[PDB]
Amino acid sequence: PYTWKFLGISKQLSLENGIAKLNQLLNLEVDLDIQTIRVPSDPDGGTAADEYIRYEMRLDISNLDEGTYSKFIFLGNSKMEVPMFLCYCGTDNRNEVVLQWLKAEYGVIMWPIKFEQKTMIKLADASIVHVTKENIEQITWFSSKLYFEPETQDKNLRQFSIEIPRESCEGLALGYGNTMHPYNDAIVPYIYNETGMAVERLPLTSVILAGHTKIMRESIVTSTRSLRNRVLAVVLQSIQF
Amino acid sequence: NSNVLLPRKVDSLKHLYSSIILIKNSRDESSSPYEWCIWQLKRCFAHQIETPQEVIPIIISVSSMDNKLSSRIIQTFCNLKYLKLDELTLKKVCGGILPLWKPELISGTREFFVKFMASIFMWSTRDGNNCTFSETCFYVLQMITNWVLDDKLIALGLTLLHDMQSLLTLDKIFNNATSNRFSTMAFISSLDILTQLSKQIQYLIVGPDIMNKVFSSDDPLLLSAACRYLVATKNKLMQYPSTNKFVRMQNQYIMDLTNYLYRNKSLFGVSPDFFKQILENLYFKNAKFFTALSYICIIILRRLETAENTIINEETFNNFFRVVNNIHDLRVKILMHLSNTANPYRDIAAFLFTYLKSLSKY
Amino acid sequence: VLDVYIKNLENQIGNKRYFLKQAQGAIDEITKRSLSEVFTELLRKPPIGFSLTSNFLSLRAQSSSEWLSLMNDQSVDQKAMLLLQNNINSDLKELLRKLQHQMTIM
Amino acid sequence: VLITRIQLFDSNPLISRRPYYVAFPLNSPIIFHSVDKDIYARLVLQSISRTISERETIIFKPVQKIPVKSIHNIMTLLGPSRFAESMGPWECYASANFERSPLHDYKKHQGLTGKKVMVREFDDSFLNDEEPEIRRLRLEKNMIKFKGSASRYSSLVPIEKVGFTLKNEINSRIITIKLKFNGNDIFGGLHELCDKNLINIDKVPGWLAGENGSFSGTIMNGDFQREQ
Amino acid sequence: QNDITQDFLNLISIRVERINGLTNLQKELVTKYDTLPLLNM
Amino acid sequence: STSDRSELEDYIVLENVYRMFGITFFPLVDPIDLKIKDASGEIFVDREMLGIRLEVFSERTSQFEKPHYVLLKKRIKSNSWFLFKHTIPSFIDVQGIFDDTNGGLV
Amino acid sequence: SSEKQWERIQQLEKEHVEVYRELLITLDRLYLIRKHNLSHTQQRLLEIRHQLQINLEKTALLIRLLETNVLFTKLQNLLEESNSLDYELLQSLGAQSSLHKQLIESRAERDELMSKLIELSSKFP
């Protein structure tokens, strides 16, 4: 139950400097690892516009409560138009004082990120691609429950949902062929072929998986604390111009 | 301070923050509110913001001055690629950034302005009825309004005015069959700017094809602004010699305009055999239509009929025979009442009294 | 009284569309066959009016009303902007005078 | 119809119960009762099932589990009526507004007059996205698919809740999906969403279009069947 | 020069059928979008 | 189209004299399964449908009543009709009669 | 029950004048091509000829109709209500021009004061 709100960052910045000012303003100590991660480590990427620099600003405090526990997962790239962004969870006041420090010190522009429909489709595509240590991408499956909430005259059709079980999802994926994108090449053409409801134009609200994640239009609710690399890669790719 | 997002967000001095940072910078290049302005404009264009109305007037008010930020905004925004994103917000920012610009960097931006005006024209024709293209013509004409106020950038202004007027006079935008008044409003604005130039470079003549097209339209506001321009260039051309066939061209213009107007009898851009061909195709009555304007004459005739107790053609002569006491003089009285008052369509009466000396004593 | 007008208007529409199609086909046939003073000779050569007058004047009325609403809204925004700009200019002039005073005092 | 109000009592003088309604249509084997699940409801329904017979025994298997709102709606849906099975795009056959009797004129006949139609598209030309006659014909096409021939969005009957299930079969794999709906009038809002060009009407199947209304059942190879 | 010439160049440069009682079955089946009987007599 | 008009009028009055029998088999096609074979652009019908037009003629008012329609659709894997969408009111049992005729398979 | 028919005949009138303008320009193009087996001025005099054709058609309509029955009250109310806003339009244009002149004066004063303030701030430096 870690609702990940998302905010934008205007200018590319390093984080190794100025962190002592945050320590002096906060009277705490935080660890900021520098993970130079790279998406689809399979060699069909060219090693260009595929790498990112992740700054997991943890707060190594007493973990007796999860609502006061708040990570700060960052991302960046020195090649795109908007280079960086962050995402924060929890309900601490330290989130407010650290966004105060980020607005005050480096002089950047913050704004919340609203989600599209194809962005939510790509996030549901990327939140199931699991990375193992043997340099390959194994794909788990979840009984996904899509959602819609349109507005009609006199509240005719309030809300309606499309639920797909796990074995059916795996059958559609194995029947489409071998690809790393199931939820944009197999299921959505199947729903368009058998129902005619194009889910790219219908108003999405909550692409919900089987207790694993819960992708929304304003936030992402998960079950574990960590967020995967492809998820933040798709989010950073989405907010470009 | 350094938090720019809380400074110009929207303290008695809170209205004066950006000027303080700009004088504390010694500017010359990319400051902090410059980056905030361009970033908020990009965020408003890419639809990444919920409400652009809480940001856009702040952008306009901080960017109405500061010519370098305005030049960078017009240099890196006025293109088709940001035109195809959102035409409303582009309309707002070009209404806010253009009439206060007055560029003096290179003074070679003629090709850039005609390229932008051609690109927005190609996009407004690619929709085909957009009611959008004439708004930026109004704004670029209000920037022509301040370009001619200084001694600098006047030749560029007049050649851009000629290019804009020749581009605004296509029948895809305005025509008497099925069109609007937006191009007419932009054209009367440009003609008013021409009057303000002529009242105080041998290119004041707008060219005879545009002259016959602005005379040929049945738009009364456009015709009143046209004859206003004609009396203005009469006042500017009276102190010029009658050689080189341009003063004679202006005489031909006012002669053709009087041929459309009260004076009868001829080459009004086309042979009178073509007039006889049309009048033999559709149809005493050969000259019963020589001068939607006559509804205003009938309405103002009913208005002046209030001071007394109680389709100008030969039927009006029959109605006069049914019971001043003429038909040839009621038009002169209508022109006199349009002359003396401060009601609009004043310039047609001003032209009819400043020319055609046999009727100037009315 | 209107149905016969609709009927002859549609008949004229079909007649003019057939004339357009035959004209374009004839010119395309001549151009596929192909591999001054004539324009002057063209210059010497050559349910409609009420429909065009009604359509033209109605769209003129709608466009003039839209132009008036747009210009009134932009006029009140530009007037509020001019008011706020002049107030900021007056406050900055007062701060300029006080800064000149504080420069003379030091 | 015949509406029967059955009221019951209890002794702590007499504390009343909730009145239980049982609606008999005149000539139909479908009997409506008010929605309850207490032991008094089962007692009243079982007593009616015992006393209506008098010659040979009758049982009451329930045909639906989701309640519906009004008595006009349930009468038009499941009573003795011509709309009892068509209910959807087949609503034209439940009113016969397309044909006349054989004793009618032949000059005013659809074979002789001809109806204005629009050429359908069968290639995938929907995912890549003016002429008001074609716009009127598109709205007429949506009116044809979601209703009969020709307010203005609400159907004949408002349906509250519908849950579908599409069990197709590709390369010997049973691929199930589970559609669920909600709201006041489902198929009217679906016609409204199709009217805004969000749903490609060329690929809307019959069961989604509104036929077999208020019936939430599965689909096994292209033919609807209700659920118990 | 080139600007006025380019402006002059830019200025100079700038299905529904009705079925009946008799028809072939392919042209009827293409436009068949209603749940009505076939009108081919 | 005058001789074809008279031929179509004779066809329509022949349809009328056949329809005076009472039990007619009008052809039909469900517009959802109009699949294209993609071999020449032509359209073949996937699942055939056959509509029955029952029409009872009265005697007192001496006119035809409202005709009741029965629609049959062929199953996808059995080559036998199953009763798709009938319009008969429910006091006349239709599904049991369709199960009773010819042992269920038609 | 006249509003739907009136908007239908409005759309029909727009389509009619569209196909009429297309007919005129394609008859001109037909005479241009078939008269012999092309410039901005030539096309401009052609559109001038078209504008004169529509103007004579307009005044022929006016002298045939005007020079309280059916299909006549629409034109009368149209000419009554179409020409009552020109004074307000010129009022709004004059207000916008005066607002632009005031903005030019304030921007010139602000830029001069900005140059003087950056001079005084370089003196402060």
PDB file of N, CA and C in Angstrom, chain B residues 235-277:
ATOM      1  N   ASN B 235      -5.377  63.677 -49.944  1.00  0.00           N
ATOM      2  CA  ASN B 235      -4.688  64.692 -49.156  1.00  0.00           C
ATOM      3  C   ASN B 235      -3.173  64.537 -49.195  1.00  0.00           C
ATOM      4  N   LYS B 236      -2.672  63.326 -49.428  1.00  0.00           N
ATOM      5  CA  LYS B 236      -1.237  63.105 -49.562  1.00  0.00           C
ATOM      6  C   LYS B 236      -0.725  63.272 -50.988  1.00  0.00           C
ATOM      7  N   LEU B 237      -1.604  63.223 -51.984  1.00  0.00           N
ATOM      8  CA  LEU B 237      -1.218  63.277 -53.384  1.00  0.00           C
ATOM      9  C   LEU B 237      -1.500  64.621 -54.029  1.00  0.00           C
ATOM     10  N   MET B 238      -2.235  65.509 -53.355  1.00  0.00           N
ATOM     11  CA  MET B 238      -2.452  66.850 -53.888  1.00  0.00           C
ATOM     12  C   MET B 238      -1.169  67.663 -54.001  1.00  0.00           C
ATOM     13  N   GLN B 239      -0.161  67.377 -53.177  1.00  0.00           N
ATOM     14  CA  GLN B 239       1.126  68.068 -53.216  1.00  0.00           C
ATOM     15  C   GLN B 239       2.152  67.319 -54.057  1.00  0.00           C
ATOM     16  N   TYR B 240       1.704  66.566 -55.052  1.00  0.00           N
ATOM     17  CA  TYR B 240       2.566  65.788 -55.924  1.00  0.00           C
ATOM     18  C   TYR B 240       2.249  66.099 -57.379  1.00  0.00           C
ATOM     19  N   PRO B 241       3.248  66.030 -58.262  1.00  0.00           N
ATOM     20  CA  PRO B 241       2.990  66.265 -59.687  1.00  0.00           C
ATOM     21  C   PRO B 241       2.194  65.130 -60.315  1.00  0.00           C
ATOM     22  N   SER B 242       1.491  65.473 -61.395  1.00  0.00           N
ATOM     23  CA  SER B 242       0.559  64.562 -62.050  1.00  0.00           C
ATOM     24  C   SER B 242       1.209  63.696 -63.124  1.00  0.00           C
ATOM     25  N   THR B 243       2.509  63.444 -63.033  1.00  0.00           N
ATOM     26  CA  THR B 243       3.208  62.639 -64.026  1.00  0.00           C
ATOM     27  C   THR B 243       3.210  61.176 -63.583  1.00  0.00           C
ATOM     28  N   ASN B 244       3.971  60.335 -64.295  1.00  0.00           N
ATOM     29  CA  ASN B 244       4.286  58.928 -64.025  1.00  0.00           C
ATOM     30  C   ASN B 244       3.078  57.999 -63.863  1.00  0.00           C
ATOM     31  N   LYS B 245       1.888  58.459 -64.261  1.00  0.00           N
ATOM     32  CA  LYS B 245       0.625  57.719 -64.331  1.00  0.00           C
ATOM     33  C   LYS B 245       0.195  57.083 -63.013  1.00  0.00           C
ATOM     34  N   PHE B 246       0.583  57.640 -61.865  1.00  0.00           N
ATOM     35  CA  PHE B 246       0.089  57.115 -60.595  1.00  0.00           C
ATOM     36  C   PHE B 246      -0.939  58.053 -59.984  1.00  0.00           C
ATOM     37  N   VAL B 247      -0.756  59.361 -60.167  1.00  0.00           N
ATOM     38  CA  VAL B 247      -1.799  60.319 -59.821  1.00  0.00           C
ATOM     39  C   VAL B 247      -2.992  60.139 -60.749  1.00  0.00           C
ATOM     40  N   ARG B 248      -2.733  59.883 -62.034  1.00  0.00           N
ATOM     41  CA  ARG B 248      -3.802  59.512 -62.952  1.00  0.00           C
ATOM     42  C   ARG B 248      -4.402  58.156 -62.594  1.00  0.00           C
ATOM     43  N   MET B 249      -3.614  57.268 -61.985  1.00  0.00           N
ATOM     44  CA  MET B 249      -4.160  56.002 -61.508  1.00  0.00           C
ATOM     45  C   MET B 249      -5.095  56.221 -60.323  1.00  0.00           C
ATOM     46  N   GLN B 250      -4.738  57.137 -59.421  1.00  0.00           N
ATOM     47  CA  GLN B 250      -5.625  57.482 -58.312  1.00  0.00           C
ATOM     48  C   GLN B 250      -6.883  58.186 -58.802  1.00  0.00           C
ATOM     49  N   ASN B 251      -6.750  58.999 -59.854  1.00  0.00           N
ATOM     50  CA  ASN B 251      -7.915  59.598 -60.495  1.00  0.00           C
ATOM     51  C   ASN B 251      -8.804  58.531 -61.126  1.00  0.00           C
ATOM     52  N   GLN B 252      -8.195  57.502 -61.720  1.00  0.00           N
ATOM     53  CA  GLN B 252      -8.960  56.372 -62.238  1.00  0.00           C
ATOM     54  C   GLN B 252      -9.651  55.601 -61.121  1.00  0.00           C
ATOM     55  N   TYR B 253      -9.006  55.503 -59.954  1.00  0.00           N
ATOM     56  CA  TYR B 253      -9.603  54.808 -58.813  1.00  0.00           C
ATOM     57  C   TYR B 253     -10.833  55.547 -58.304  1.00  0.00           C
ATOM     58  N   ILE B 254     -10.710  56.862 -58.093  1.00  0.00           N
ATOM     59  CA  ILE B 254     -11.858  57.622 -57.596  1.00  0.00           C
ATOM     60  C   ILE B 254     -12.928  57.749 -58.674  1.00  0.00           C
ATOM     61  N   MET B 255     -12.534  57.718 -59.953  1.00  0.00           N
ATOM     62  CA  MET B 255     -13.513  57.745 -61.033  1.00  0.00           C
ATOM     63  C   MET B 255     -14.312  56.453 -61.076  1.00  0.00           C
ATOM     64  N   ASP B 256     -13.640  55.307 -60.922  1.00  0.00           N
ATOM     65  CA  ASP B 256     -14.338  54.027 -60.886  1.00  0.00           C
ATOM     66  C   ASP B 256     -15.203  53.885 -59.638  1.00  0.00           C
ATOM     67  N   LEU B 257     -14.747  54.438 -58.511  1.00  0.00           N
ATOM     68  CA  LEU B 257     -15.547  54.373 -57.294  1.00  0.00           C
ATOM     69  C   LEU B 257     -16.790  55.248 -57.415  1.00  0.00           C
ATOM     70  N   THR B 258     -16.680  56.393 -58.099  1.00  0.00           N
ATOM     71  CA  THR B 258     -17.871  57.189 -58.369  1.00  0.00           C
ATOM     72  C   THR B 258     -18.749  56.542 -59.432  1.00  0.00           C
ATOM     73  N   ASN B 259     -18.159  55.734 -60.317  1.00  0.00           N
ATOM     74  CA  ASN B 259     -18.963  54.957 -61.256  1.00  0.00           C
ATOM     75  C   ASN B 259     -19.791  53.908 -60.531  1.00  0.00           C
ATOM     76  N   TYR B 260     -19.244  53.304 -59.474  1.00  0.00           N
ATOM     77  CA  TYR B 260     -20.093  52.464 -58.636  1.00  0.00           C
ATOM     78  C   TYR B 260     -21.087  53.302 -57.841  1.00  0.00           C
ATOM     79  N   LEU B 261     -20.719  54.528 -57.496  1.00  0.00           N
ATOM     80  CA  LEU B 261     -21.530  55.374 -56.636  1.00  0.00           C
ATOM     81  C   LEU B 261     -22.458  56.241 -57.488  1.00  0.00           C
ATOM     82  N   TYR B 262     -22.992  57.309 -56.880  1.00  0.00           N
ATOM     83  CA  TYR B 262     -24.083  58.166 -57.350  1.00  0.00           C
ATOM     84  C   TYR B 262     -24.001  58.622 -58.805  1.00  0.00           C
ATOM     85  N   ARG B 263     -22.801  58.903 -59.303  1.00  0.00           N
ATOM     86  CA  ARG B 263     -22.650  59.339 -60.682  1.00  0.00           C
ATOM     87  C   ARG B 263     -22.848  58.176 -61.645  1.00  0.00           C
ATOM     88  N   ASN B 264     -23.626  58.430 -62.690  1.00  0.00           N
ATOM     89  CA  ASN B 264     -23.933  57.453 -63.722  1.00  0.00           C
ATOM     90  C   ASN B 264     -22.899  57.530 -64.840  1.00  0.00           C
ATOM     91  N   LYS B 265     -22.750  56.400 -65.538  1.00  0.00           N
ATOM     92  CA  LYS B 265     -21.811  56.198 -66.651  1.00  0.00           C
ATOM     93  C   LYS B 265     -20.363  56.549 -66.304  1.00  0.00           C
ATOM     94  N   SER B 266     -17.156  53.530 -70.528  1.00  0.00           N
ATOM     95  CA  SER B 266     -17.008  53.161 -69.127  1.00  0.00           C
ATOM     96  C   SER B 266     -16.314  51.812 -68.993  1.00  0.00           C
ATOM     97  N   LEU B 267     -15.299  51.750 -68.130  1.00  0.00           N
ATOM     98  CA  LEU B 267     -14.550  50.517 -67.921  1.00  0.00           C
ATOM     99  C   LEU B 267     -14.318  50.322 -66.429  1.00  0.00           C
ATOM    100  N   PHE B 268     -15.247  49.635 -65.772  1.00  0.00           N
ATOM    101  CA  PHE B 268     -15.132  49.306 -64.349  1.00  0.00           C
ATOM    102  C   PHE B 268     -14.428  47.966 -64.154  1.00  0.00           C
ATOM    103  N   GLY B 269     -13.184  47.887 -64.626  1.00  0.00           N
ATOM    104  CA  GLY B 269     -12.419  46.660 -64.585  1.00  0.00           C
ATOM    105  C   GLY B 269     -12.742  45.658 -65.671  1.00  0.00           C
ATOM    106  N   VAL B 270     -13.798  45.888 -66.455  1.00  0.00           N
ATOM    107  CA  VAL B 270     -14.250  44.969 -67.488  1.00  0.00           C
ATOM    108  C   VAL B 270     -15.115  45.768 -68.465  1.00  0.00           C
ATOM    109  N   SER B 271     -15.195  45.273 -69.711  1.00  0.00           N
ATOM    110  CA  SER B 271     -15.904  45.893 -70.820  1.00  0.00           C
ATOM    111  C   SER B 271     -17.405  45.998 -70.539  1.00  0.00           C
ATOM    112  N   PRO B 272     -18.060  47.062 -71.027  1.00  0.00           N
ATOM    113  CA  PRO B 272     -19.520  47.159 -70.871  1.00  0.00           C
ATOM    114  C   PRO B 272     -20.296  46.203 -71.757  1.00  0.00           C
ATOM    115  N   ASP B 273     -19.658  45.623 -72.781  1.00  0.00           N
ATOM    116  CA  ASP B 273     -20.284  44.533 -73.517  1.00  0.00           C
ATOM    117  C   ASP B 273     -20.476  43.309 -72.631  1.00  0.00           C
ATOM    118  N   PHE B 274     -19.589  43.110 -71.656  1.00  0.00           N
ATOM    119  CA  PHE B 274     -19.775  42.038 -70.684  1.00  0.00           C
ATOM    120  C   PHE B 274     -20.950  42.340 -69.758  1.00  0.00           C
ATOM    121  N   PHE B 275     -21.131  43.620 -69.412  1.00  0.00           N
ATOM    122  CA  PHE B 275     -22.317  44.050 -68.673  1.00  0.00           C
ATOM    123  C   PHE B 275     -23.587  43.779 -69.467  1.00  0.00           C
ATOM    124  N   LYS B 276     -23.554  44.040 -70.775  1.00  0.00           N
ATOM    125  CA  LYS B 276     -24.721  43.777 -71.611  1.00  0.00           C
ATOM    126  C   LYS B 276     -24.953  42.280 -71.788  1.00  0.00           C
ATOM    127  N   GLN B 277     -23.878  41.485 -71.774  1.00  0.00           N
ATOM    128  CA  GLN B 277     -24.016  40.032 -71.831  1.00  0.00           C
ATOM    129  C   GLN B 277     -24.687  39.488 -70.574  1.00  0.00           C
TER     130      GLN B 277
END
